[PDB]
Automatic annotation (TrEMBL):
Every Bromo domain range: 18-88
Cellular compartment(s): Nucleus
Membership in a protein family: Belongs to the acetyltransferase family. GCN5 subfamily.
Record-given protein name: histone acetyltransferase
Full-protein residues shown: 548 to 654 of 655
Species: Cryptosporidium parvum (strain Iowa II)
């Protein structure tokens, strides 16, 4: 009975990811207040709301396009934080948590 296109399956993966308690620093774009130097360092930013918007508008043509962006979200965090802070710990935890679901996405 349940029928979901690739983009809707991507949206639900992102929803699962966002609902994790430690996903909070990735739900929306980084604010100037929290990190005024952020966009001087991260030249290809992304976040859950951006990817959810892309998914809802059925903009992912392939799974690779989304998986590169989702990996980039975790990579950006770890680069900005120089592989340190609580954010690197969350990034590692969440990537390992969501990677099994990423394998199930059907094109």
């Amino acid at each position: 009975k349940v029928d979901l296109s690739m983009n809707d399956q991507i949206w639900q993966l992102l929803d699962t990811l966002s609902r994790h308690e430690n996903a909070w620093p990735f739900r929306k774009p980084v604010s100037i207040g929290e990190a005024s130097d952020y966009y001087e360092i991260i030249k290809e930013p992304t976040d859950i709301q951006t990817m959810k918007r892309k998914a809802k508008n059925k903009e992912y043509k392939t799974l690779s396009e989304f998986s590169s962006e989702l990996k980039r979200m975790f990579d950006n965090c770890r680069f900005y934080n120089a592989k340190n802070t609580i954010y690197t710990k969350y990034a590692n935890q969440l990537e390992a948590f969501i990677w099994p679901m990423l394998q199930t996405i059907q094109e």
